[PDB]
């Protein structure tokens, strides 16, 4: 229901502040480190570069994040790695490369087996934010290889996706139809056919309904992903906090069984406007 709302947030830019400080706010239950956005056929060991934060181009190594990640997890926050994003050049390449990449993610990000870009860690999940890939092929293969690895080691990491709000999604529909994601974060912004606007919840309500019908199983596995300010959604979609709580959430069909909470793009925007602070007050 509404009171059990969990909040997620994207993190990975200079203006976001430190990861540790983001967790210690205690506003969030999930944080996406964003993004791993360059990989494809000839890139056997993908590197992480966070703009103005860490990477070979910044002169500060991303492995300094290891202790902050661990502090977050200790205080009950789940830390995901997000693939893809609005920028970069990414592709799953082929059925063979999809196996290579799934093994790479498991060895270096999910099991503490070796030292990787974020140091020696075991993250809580992998998040498919496939907004603008080279093409739509092989994303289902990547998902299915990670799912299989989970069975082999009896691991507990989670798998999630962030499709656009118009079903069926151009890039992730085959993957979503496997029924093997744990969570779906539907992006209700930058699309006039399915987002909120002042005095009209009919299009977002209908789109929520379409997603409850086409996503199985029928668990609490659906989040709304929304912009945390007007500035991070030049295509529209921003919902003021009082309108979210009062005019939108009470009127989503099957809220009781399907709704898991909200995700905010992004941490910088959230700091600037107090979005999640005002939501938490009205819970």
Numbering used by the authors: 1 to 283
Task: Reproduce, without paraphrasing, sentences from the article in which this PDB structure was first reported.
Our results demonstrate that MHz XFELs can be used to collect high-quality serial femtosecond crystallography data, and that under the conditions used in the current experiment, shock waves caused by the interaction between the sample jet and the XFEL pulses do not compromise the data to a measurable extent. Therefore, now that the first MHz XFEL has become available, we investigated this issue at current EuXFEL operating parameters, using microcrystals of the model protein lysozyme.
As well as addressing the challenges associated with MHz data repetition rates using a model system (lysozyme protein crystals), we investigated a microcrystalline preparation of jack bean proteins precipitated with acetone, a preparation described by James Sumner, who used this technique for the first crystallization of an enzyme (urease) in 192618, resulting in a Nobel Prize in 194619. To this end, we collected SFX data of a microcrystalline mixture of jack bean proteins, crystallized using acetone as published previously. Due to their small size (on the order of 5–10 μm) the crystals could not be further characterized before the beam time and it thus remained unclear which proteins had in fact crystallized. In contrast to the concanavalin A and B microcrystals, which diffracted strongly, urease microcrystals diffracted only to low resolution and with low signal-to-noise ratio, and no structure was refined. Given the lysozyme results, it appears unlikely that our jack bean protein data are compromised by radiation damage or by shock wave effects in the current experiment. Moreover, in just one shift (12 h) of data collection, ~77,000 indexed images were collected of concanavalin A and ~24,000 of concanavalin B, despite this being one of the very first experiments at a new facility.
